[PDB]
Amino acid sequence: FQSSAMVLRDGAKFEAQAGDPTQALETYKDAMVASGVTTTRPQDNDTFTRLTRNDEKDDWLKRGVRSDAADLYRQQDLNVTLEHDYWGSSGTGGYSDLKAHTTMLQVDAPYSDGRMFFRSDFVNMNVGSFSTNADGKWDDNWGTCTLQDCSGNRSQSDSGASVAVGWRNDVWSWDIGTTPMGFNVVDVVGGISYSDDIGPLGYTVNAHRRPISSSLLAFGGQKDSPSNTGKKWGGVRADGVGLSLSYDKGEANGVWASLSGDQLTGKNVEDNWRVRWMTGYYYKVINQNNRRVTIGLNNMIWHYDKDLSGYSLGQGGYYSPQEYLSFAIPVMWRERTENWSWELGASGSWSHSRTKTMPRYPLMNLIPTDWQEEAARQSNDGGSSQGFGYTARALLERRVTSNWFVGTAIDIQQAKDYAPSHFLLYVRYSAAGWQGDMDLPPQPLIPYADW
Ligand SMILES: CCCCCCCCCCCCCCCCCC(=O)OC[C@H](COP(=O)(O)OCCN)OC(=O)CCCCCCCCCCCCCCCCC
Numbered sequence: 001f002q003s004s005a006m007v008l009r010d011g012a013k014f015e016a017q018a019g020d021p022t023q024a025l026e027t028y029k030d031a032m033v034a035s036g037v038t039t040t041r042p043q044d045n046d047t048f049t050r051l052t053r054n055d056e057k058d059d060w061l062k063r064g065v066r067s068d069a070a071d072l073y074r075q076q077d078l079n080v081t082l083e084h085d086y087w088g089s090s091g092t093g094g095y096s097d098l099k100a101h102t103t104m105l106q107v108d109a110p111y112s113d114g115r116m117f118f119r120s121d122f123v124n125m126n127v128g129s130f131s132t133n134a135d136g137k138w139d140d141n142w143g144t145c146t147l148q149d150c151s152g153n154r155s156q157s158d159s160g161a162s163v164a165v166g167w168r169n170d171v172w173s174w175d176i177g178t179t180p181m182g183f184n185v186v187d188v189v190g191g192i193s194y195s196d197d198i199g200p201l202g203y204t205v206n207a208h209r210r211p212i213s214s215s216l217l218a219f220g221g222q223k224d225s226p227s228n229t230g231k232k233w234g235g236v237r238a239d240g241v242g243l244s245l246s247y248d249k250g251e252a253n254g255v256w257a258s259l260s261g262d263q264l265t266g267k268n269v270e271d272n273w274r275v276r277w278m279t280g281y282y283y284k285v286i287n288q289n290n291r292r293v294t295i296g297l298n299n300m301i302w303h304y305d306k307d308l309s310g311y312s313l314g315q316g317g318y319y320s321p322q323e324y325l326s327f328a329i330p331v332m333w334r335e336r337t338e339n340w341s342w343e344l345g346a347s348g349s350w351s352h353s354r355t356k357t358m359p360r361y362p363l364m365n366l367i368p369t370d371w372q373e374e375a376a377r378q379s380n381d382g383g384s385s386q387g388f389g390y391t392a393r394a395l396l397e398r399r400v401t402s403n404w405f406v407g408t409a410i411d412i413q414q415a416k417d418y419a420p421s422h423f424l425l426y427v428r429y430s431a432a433g434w435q436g437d438m439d440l441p442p443q444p445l446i447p448y449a450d451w
Pocket residue numbers: 285293294295297298299327328329331332346347348349350387388389390
């Protein structure tokens with residue numbers, strides 16, 4: 001025979017796997033008594049979840065009962081999250097002076113042993129106005145304005161709403177969704193991933209189609225000035241696959257690698273592709289239940305076939321170097337108390353970038369025949385540069401009540417890879433209530449475009 005604690009723990013897992021997680025959570029309440037977590041059966045969810053808070057004096061039985069109960073309870077809870085993200089990057093009026101707002105609403109709920117989500121993103125992107133000459137025209141390296149001075153669409157901005165649905169458990173994940181409807185170029189996007197542990201190392205394989213959100217042109221597309229061609233172009237999407245490996249030795253060390261490759265395609269944009277390699281090593285200087293401090297070394301190497309970072313018609317307005325090398329030293333401090341959880345991090349880096357000389361107008365059939373001779377003699381000069389940069393990030397979340405959580409995050413991107421910075425605020429509602437350990441780190445919503 002087995003001990004009462006073991007019988008109840010086993011029975012709870014059996015009930016959950018059989019499709020009765022509600023009964024399983026009741027059995028975990030009994031398991032807490034039989035295991036010695038408490039002397040009296042919890043009769044409210046706040047008492048129950050408070051008893052799942054980790055305790056470093058726990059032996060393995062008590063530690064597992066708490067963690068198993070907490071994992072099932074979190075998996076079964078209905079959450080609703082509302083988030084606003086203000087993001088962007090400095091640049092040139094009319095196409096890259098980017099100030100953007102994303103508002104996100106997400107509902108998460110159990111399904112089988114995983115969680116389903118339902119998401120809407122509302123995106124507004126403002127890229128400012130073209131600078132004009134006395135005539136009121138401009139000749140920026142954008143659209144076809146270097147082939148004939150442009151007029152008519154001086155102020156540039158767009159807005160749209162996307163939706164997404166998906167599901168994930170510990171083994172696999174999928175999502176399907178859209179890019180914002182209301183933009184010039186609208187697509188179906190999504191992904192699928194599978195994870196397993198072939199011994200000591202973990203791996204994840206995935207396939208995805210995602211937008212490039214770093215500029216309006218790349219994300220939603222723009223229209224050439226009505227004085228010129230008026231053609232829509234942009235809306236670049238990455239269709240590709242990736243493999244990640246992790247040989248986490250447990251304990252204080254860990255290493256990981258990732259190799260991925262994508263086709264990069266858009267509306268009236270020259271075809272492109274990229275392959276990207278990343279590795280990392282990390283060391284846990286402090287590794288406690290409520291405080292984790294890490295320092296690491298990260299490397300990245302990228303290659304894009306073509307430099308389509310220009311904003312002329314036929315290019316895509318996205319960073320696409322032919323050589324990219326980065327070496328970084330990330331540091332991170334994560335900590336939680338009874339009702340707060342935060343992360344503070346930074347990462348100094350050195351990087352090298354090189355781009356080849358490209359035709360400014362790589363798709364000649366978008367160009368009027370009486371402009372094609374002049375277009376063919378226009379090129380974007382290649383270049384290269386190296387330097388130091390950094391990123392920094394702060395995340396803060398607090399429990400207001402059992403049902404209400406609020407958080408902020410700031411993501412400072414100054415590492416010379418043209419990524420935008422982000423500032424966000426969110427509120428998360430727990431239907432059942434949660435008085436267990438805070439999430440470490442906090443988990444804000446990620447804009448769907450950046451999955
Ligand atoms: C026990 C340990 C305790 C640790 C506790 C940690 C808590 C620390 C608490 C304080 C936090 C301090 C934060 C310090 C990190 C922040 C870095 C930073 O912000 O500096 C930015 C700086 C860029 O500034 P800039 O003026 O442009 O140039 C400087 C020239 N040096 O950029 C830099 O700083 C330069 C960074 C250098 C990056 C070099 C990357 C080398 C990586 C090695 C790769 C080797 C792998 C071999 C690969 C083989 C081939 C694939």
